[PDB]
Write an enzyme that holds these catalytic residues in place. Structure first.
Site, PDB file in Angstrom:
ATOM      1  N   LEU A 193     111.710  11.585 122.994  1.00 50.74           N
ATOM      2  CA  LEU A 193     112.537  12.812 122.961  1.00 50.74           C
ATOM      3  C   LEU A 193     112.804  13.213 124.401  1.00 50.74           C
ATOM      4  CD1 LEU A 193     110.813  14.696 120.022  1.00 50.74           C
ATOM      5  CD2 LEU A 193     112.791  13.161 119.958  1.00 50.74           C
ATOM      6  N   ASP A 194     113.906  12.727 124.934  1.00 54.63           N
ATOM      7  CA  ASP A 194     114.322  12.994 126.321  1.00 54.63           C
ATOM      8  C   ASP A 194     114.438  14.505 126.538  1.00 54.63           C
ATOM      9  OD1 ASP A 194     115.597  11.917 128.917  1.00 54.63           O
ATOM     10  OD2 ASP A 194     117.058  13.383 128.110  1.00 54.63           O
ATOM     11  N   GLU A 235     109.271  13.668 126.288  1.00 52.91           N
ATOM     12  CA  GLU A 235     109.285  13.615 127.769  1.00 52.91           C
ATOM     13  C   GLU A 235     109.137  15.048 128.282  1.00 52.91           C
ATOM     14  OE1 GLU A 235     112.943  13.510 129.855  1.00 52.91           O
ATOM     15  OE2 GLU A 235     112.060  12.587 131.653  1.00 52.91           O
ATOM     16  N   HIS A 292     111.778   5.027 135.423  1.00 53.90           N
ATOM     17  CA  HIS A 292     113.162   4.926 135.931  1.00 53.90           C
ATOM     18  C   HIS A 292     113.554   6.124 136.791  1.00 53.90           C
ATOM     19  CE1 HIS A 292     113.265   7.455 132.437  1.00 53.90           C
ATOM     20  NE2 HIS A 292     114.547   7.807 132.717  1.00 53.90           N
ATOM     21  N   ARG A 393     117.920   7.959 143.000  1.00 55.50           N
ATOM     22  CA  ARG A 393     117.054   7.263 142.020  1.00 55.50           C
ATOM     23  C   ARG A 393     117.333   5.758 142.036  1.00 55.50           C
ATOM     24  NH1 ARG A 393     117.281  10.835 136.638  1.00 55.50           N
ATOM     25  NH2 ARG A 393     119.320  11.331 137.554  1.00 55.50           N
TER      26      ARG A 393
END
Length: 481
Positions: A193-194, A235, A292, A393
């Site tokens: 669950l972002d 998350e 990531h 990133r």
């Protein structure tokens, strides 16, 4: 669906280990067949921004990557984790485009949080603005310009393309239920669950982990997926009390504190903060060193003293390979200016011994270790990619060809990390239900994993960067090998 099991999980893009999903399967089968038991394929749906995290739809795979068949092919003998973006959807989605065109006549009129409707009086007060939890300076909205000539503001936590969903809307809850059902039908073993803690907004609230509504949403999703034999992983990057409060109610959590606690331990020779952390962690967690995203710093608040946090950050920038504070700045397009943008190997100055020690600690830590693909190949900071995209990133998002994965197989550090992953996946002492005894003394961190008569001891010399692994049941040293 292959069931989520007690094996190392790879985190990868669909196009970062080889060119696409078919090459990803080739890479895993060729070099990582016993090392990788599970795969989190980062969002592989068509997306408008934030490398997958602004999905346009869940109804097709990004054709650049392949097909649902190519995803299911990886899932044949490796369990799969997919992302569901419970918080937001692309401004380029059918749903948002139709909302801009038709406004109050749109089927998706209630999918987005309109300032004029959400805020008492039709706008927030400065007090209410100031209360909202932020990780970058930009205001948490964008303008919506409707085809009829009218305008509003819609809630926007992340990039301008990521429009927040209204989870209070029955039609949005129907969309959530339908999308999770479809993911379960496509062999998901776990759904991540972002941005979970952002999902509930309240006027005058932080809009971060807003209780009790955030718990009711979690229970709705977990209950539905439990009935399908699917696990859920929220998350959440923040103070450890939040994830430990989830663990206390029987939810899987991420450990996002391990990365910086481990860096600090390896730079200072002091294991005391890492030992305290390891002892308070639950068994049902996923550990990280790299993901990531960048390294979490707020995640170690009250686990590492502020003086020691400042000290390890200075050491990463001074002694790490090719870090630069500018890479976390607004100029390099960051959604969180408080994370450190680096590969984990380069955070340790590309030191093979201490990088392997960090992974050994992670693998003896409670729960299931996640290995990010750049870390799998002991990857260095990619300044070439970072400077091409101006996306901080990207320092930690190198795209490997199959040729480059193969070229990396000759490196002892890559061989040794694969050996540690194979040990973690085969040795019975790593039982998810087993006990961990941790001791920190004389610059050593000792981690004893027990399961019945199994007893496997990691002894890390944090000063020398050398560790040993001893099978106490069978009376044999496994590492060095």
């Amino acid at each position: 669906t292959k069931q989520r099991d007690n094996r190392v999980m790879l985190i990868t893009y669909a196009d970062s280990l080889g060119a696409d999903l078919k090459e990803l399967k080739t890479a895993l089968d060729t070099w990582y067949d016993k090392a990788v038991g599970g795969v989190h394929i980062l969002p592989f749906f068509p997306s408008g921004a934030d490398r997958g995290f602004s999905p346009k739809t869940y109804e097709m795979v990004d054709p650049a990557f392949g097909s649902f068949a190519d995803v299911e092919a990886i899932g044949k003998d490796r369990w799969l984790m997919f992302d569901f973006m419970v918080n937001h959807i692309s401004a380029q989605s059918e749903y948002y485009r139709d909302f801009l065109e038709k406004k109050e006549e749109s089927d998706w009129k209630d999918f987005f949080i309109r300032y004029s409707k959400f805020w008492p009086g039709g706008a927030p007060t400065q007090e209410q603005v100031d209360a909202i939890y932020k990780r970058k300076p930009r205001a948490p909205y964008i303008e919506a310009h409707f085809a009829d000539g009218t305008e509003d503001k819609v809630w926007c936590t992340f990039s301008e393309d990521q429009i927040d969903l209204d989870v209070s809307s029955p039609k949005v809850l129907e969309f959530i239920d339908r999308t999770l059902d479809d993911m379960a039908d496509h062999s998901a073993s776990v759904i991540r669950l972002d941005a979970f803690a952002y999902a509930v907004k309240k006027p005058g609230g932080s809009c971060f982990f807003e209780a009790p509504e955030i718990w009711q949403l979690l229970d709705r999703i977990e209950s539905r997926m439990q009935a399908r034999g699917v696990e859920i992983l929220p998350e959440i990057h923040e103070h450890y009390t939040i994830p430990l409060s989830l663990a206390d109610r029987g939810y899987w959590i991420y450990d996002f504190a391990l990365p910086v606690l481990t860096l600090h331990a390896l730079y200072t020779g002091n294991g005391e903060y890492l030992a305290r952390w390891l002892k308070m962690c639950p068994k049902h967690q996923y550990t990280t060193l790299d993901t990531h995203d960048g390294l979490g710093v707020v995640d170690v608040r009250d686990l590492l003293p502020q003086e020691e946090t400042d000290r390890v950050l200075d050491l990463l920038y001074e002694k790490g390979a090719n870090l630069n504070r500018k890479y976390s700045s607004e100029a390099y397009g960051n959604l969180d200016i408080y994370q450190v943008n680096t590969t984990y190997y380069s955070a340790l100055g590309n030191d093979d011994a201490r990088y392997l020690m960090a992974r050994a600690i992670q693998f003896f830590a409670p729960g299931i270790p996640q290995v990010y693909y750049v870390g799998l190949l002991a990857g260095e900071n990619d300044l070439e990619l970072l400077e091409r995209t101006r996306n901080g990133r990207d320092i930690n998002r190198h795209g490997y060809s199959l040729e480059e994965i193969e070229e990396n197989q000759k490196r002892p550090v890559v061989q040794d990390l694969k050996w540690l992953m194979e040990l973690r996946n085969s040795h019975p002492a790593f039982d998810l239900e087993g006990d961990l005894d941790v001791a920190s003394e004389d610059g050593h961190l000792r981690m004893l994993r027990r399961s019945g008569d199994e007893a496997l001891e990691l002894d890390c010399d944090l000063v020398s960067g050398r560790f040993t692994i001893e099978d106490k049941k069978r009376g044999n040293r496994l590492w060095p090998y």
